[PDB]
Write a protein that binds this ligand. Structure first.
Ligand code: MG
Length: 487
């Protein structure tokens, strides 16, 4: 058997789960085992102050509980969860995310709109045939990402607050005859307003291919196909790779705008989106029209597929850079069943902290880097190394302030090895906190001596990661002096 992995995203409208298995060949690919979508509709559970309600917290917990059960059922174990920037509230995101972590075990890490767009672009890459020059729009309930790239990754990302829920709420629809058309016009003016300053970066040139993802675009492609006399997206197994034109979109929108909100849910393809679909289609049409697009291709791949790709990419990049002996450690860790993505991130952070400390004058014995790397890989387990090295690794990997010296089989290392274990376990614990949310995103920017202590600048950290460093950096402060974490 190979490695089963689980990723999940929490957006404004829905939550998504991907369970997959890595491909043999350390190539970066995967095989899809199962997928799940939960219509969490958190954008409907925001209060007057932009915070998520307890009902919205309940819906979130149910989604992560279903997600975590399916993943454990497949052998996936840990589920990395990213949330878009609006789903978890304007000021209380940290509190909401800690709460669901306590209730379910999974921690929804808020990422930026830019990072969401980059990852979504990778999922699109996994689904469709990108060219040398691609513009992707990803419309959700909260934001719209514009992304331009070539055949492998995003080069430029813009994130605008033009989500289908947000636009539906911002232009309440009247009860008159042209009420739909008026909502669509006003939404179209909001789109141009926010897009005009940066439209050039995403405008059509000869050969530009436009792509659309997420559920609005998927519902639109279905509806347009059935307008050309097609069958529900059941036939043809979905809408992946389907194409449609700006004109067809406009006609769909004209039809939807003439209909009453109730009647839109009886338009074939729109059956599940009647409440937002008018605003959402005005956003797509108005944004594409501003960019000069004439035809699009719809993609069923999106954020969750890009999450899997980035995770496997970080895993195998670390694996390839490792030595023969260290790769054997990673393989052994996998056999025990540890999260290799978490192992690799903690090893990389450990190595980064270790190297900064060396550059700052901290002395370490030659095998120190090698012992820390191996203990980092094995730190969550419930060949080519000497028996002393293995014992050091073991103690680094399983360090706790409370040993009992007199109890039989107590392992008392020589004073120099005692001191080494304590310093390397202090690094390891800080690195472990920096990936406490299991995002793979933390990075060490700088590590400077702050008097008799140190100052550590980090990026890509969630509130849970910073709190973890404060709880686990106690050993570091004892060995290296007080530690302040910033950014
Ligand atoms: Mg850990």
């Amino acid at each position: 058997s190979h490695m089963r992995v689980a990723v999940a995203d929490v957006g404004t409208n829905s939550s998504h789960l991907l369970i997959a298995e890595a491909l043999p060949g350390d190539a970066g690919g995967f095989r899809v085992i199962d997928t799940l979508k939960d219509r969490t509709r958190l954008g409907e559970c925001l209060d007057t102050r932009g915070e998520l309600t307890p009902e919205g917290e309940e819906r979130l917990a149910s989604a992560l509980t279903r997600f975590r059960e399916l993943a454990a059922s497949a052998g996936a174990g840990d589920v990395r969860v990213y949330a878009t920037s609006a789903l978890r509230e304007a000021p209380n995101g940290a509190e909401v995310a800690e709460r669901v972590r306590q209730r379910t075990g999974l921690y929804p890490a808020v990422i930026s709109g830019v990072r969401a767009g980059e990852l979504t672009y990778l999922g699109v890459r996994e689904a469709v045939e990108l060219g040398p020059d691609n513009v992707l729009l990803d419309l959700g309930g909260g934001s719209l990402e514009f992304v331009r790239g070539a055949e492998e990754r995003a080069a430029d990302v813009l994130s605008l607050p033009l989500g289908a829920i947000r636009m539906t709420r911002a232009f309440p629809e009247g009860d008159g005859k042209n009420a739909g058309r008026d909502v669509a016009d006003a939404v179209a003016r909001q789109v141009r307003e926010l897009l005009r300053p940066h439209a050039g970066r995403f405008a059509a040139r000869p050969g530009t291919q436009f792509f659309l993802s997420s559920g609005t675009a998927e519902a639109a492609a279905d509806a347009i196909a059935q307008r050309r006399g097609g069958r529900p997206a059941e036939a043809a197994g979905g809408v992946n790779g389907e194409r449609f034109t700006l004109t067809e979109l406009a006609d769909l929108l004209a039809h939807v705008a003439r209909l009453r909100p109730a009647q839109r849910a009886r338009v074939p393809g729109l059956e599940r989106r009647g409440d937002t679909i008018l605003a959402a289609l005005s956003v797509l049409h108005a944004a594409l029209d501003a960019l000069g697009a004439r035809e699009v291709t719809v993609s069923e791949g999106a954020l969750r597929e890009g999450m899997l790709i980035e995770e496997l990419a970080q895993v195998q990049t670390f694996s390839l850079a490792l030595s023969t002996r260290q790769r054997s450690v990673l393989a052994t860790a996998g056999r025990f069943g540890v999260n290799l993505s978490h192992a690799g991130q903690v090893a990389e952070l450990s190595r980064e902290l270790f190297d900064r400390l060396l550059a700052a004058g901290e002395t370490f014995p030659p095998p120190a880097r090698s012992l820390l790397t191996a203990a980092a890989v094995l730190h969550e387990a419930g060949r080519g190394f000497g028996p002393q090295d293995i014992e050091l690794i073991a103690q680094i990997a399983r360090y706790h302030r409370k040993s009992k010296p007199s109890h039989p089989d107590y392992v008392a290392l020589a004073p120099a090895d005692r001191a080494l274990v304590a310093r390397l376990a202090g690094i390891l614990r800080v690195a472990d906190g920096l990936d406490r949310a299991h995002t793979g995103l933390a990075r060490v920017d700088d590590l400077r001596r702050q008097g008799q202590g140190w100052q550590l600048r980090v990026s890509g950290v969630t509130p849970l990661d910073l709190a973890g460093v404060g709880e686990k950096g106690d050993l570091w402060a004892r060995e290296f002096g007080p530690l302040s974490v910033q950014n």
